[PDB]
Design an enzyme around this catalytic site. Structure first.
Site, mmCIF file in Angstrom:
data_model
loop_
_atom_site.group_PDB
_atom_site.id
_atom_site.type_symbol
_atom_site.label_atom_id
_atom_site.label_comp_id
_atom_site.label_asym_id
_atom_site.label_seq_id
_atom_site.Cartn_x
_atom_site.Cartn_y
_atom_site.Cartn_z
ATOM 1 C CG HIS A 39 7.837 1.437 -2.213
ATOM 2 N ND1 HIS A 39 6.520 1.203 -2.571
ATOM 3 C CD2 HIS A 39 8.144 0.499 -1.274
ATOM 4 C CE1 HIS A 39 6.047 0.199 -1.854
ATOM 5 N NE2 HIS A 39 7.014 -0.260 -1.072
ATOM 6 C CB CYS A 89 5.276 5.392 -4.722
ATOM 7 S SG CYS A 89 6.019 3.836 -5.336
ATOM 8 C CG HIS A 92 2.896 0.600 -5.701
ATOM 9 N ND1 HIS A 92 2.348 -0.511 -6.316
ATOM 10 C CD2 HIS A 92 4.117 0.219 -5.252
ATOM 11 C CE1 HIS A 92 3.189 -1.530 -6.210
ATOM 12 N NE2 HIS A 92 4.279 -1.107 -5.588
ATOM 13 C CG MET A 97 2.744 4.584 -2.164
ATOM 14 S SD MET A 97 3.729 3.066 -2.127
ATOM 15 C CE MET A 97 4.852 3.531 -0.787
HETATM 16 CU CU LIG Z 1 5.368 2.368 -3.817
#
Ligand SMILES: [Cu+]
Length: 105
Positions: A39, A89, A92, A97
């Site tokens: 991440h 992130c 994602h 995210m």
């Molecule tokens: Cu992530």
């Protein structure tokens, strides 16, 4: 006060947990890899105070975090203006995210 934000839910969902945190001057937010790394933590320059790219770049951890339990933290002291700071992130982002820190004043 220090607030821990997990990166990845226990189930594996691509979420920051908790996604929304309210902090007061001098508090720390610490992001910690929990599930399914990597991440990272990118602040959106159009959604921090002053819509400042410099501020967003200062607060970001753009390097991917691969290691279990790898952490990154910010202490919200006086060089951080009051207001909301939206982040995401990059791996994602498409899956939602995202998170938001509200810095009180
Ligand atoms: Cu992530």
């Amino acid at each position: 006060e220090t607030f821990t934000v997990k990166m990845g839910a226990d189930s594996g969902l691509f979420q920051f947990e908790p996604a929304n945190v309210t902090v007061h001057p001098g508090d720390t937010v610490k992001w910690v890899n929990n599930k399914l790394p990597p991440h990272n933590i990118l602040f959106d320059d159009k959604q921090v105070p002053g819509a400042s790219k410099e501020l967003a770049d200062k607060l970001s951890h753009s390097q991917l975090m691969f290691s279990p339990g790898e952490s990154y933290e910010i202490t919200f002291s006086s060089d951080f203006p009051a207001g909301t700071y939206t982040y995401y992130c990059a791996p994602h982002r498409g899956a939602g995210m995202v998170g938001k820190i509200t810095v009180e004043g």
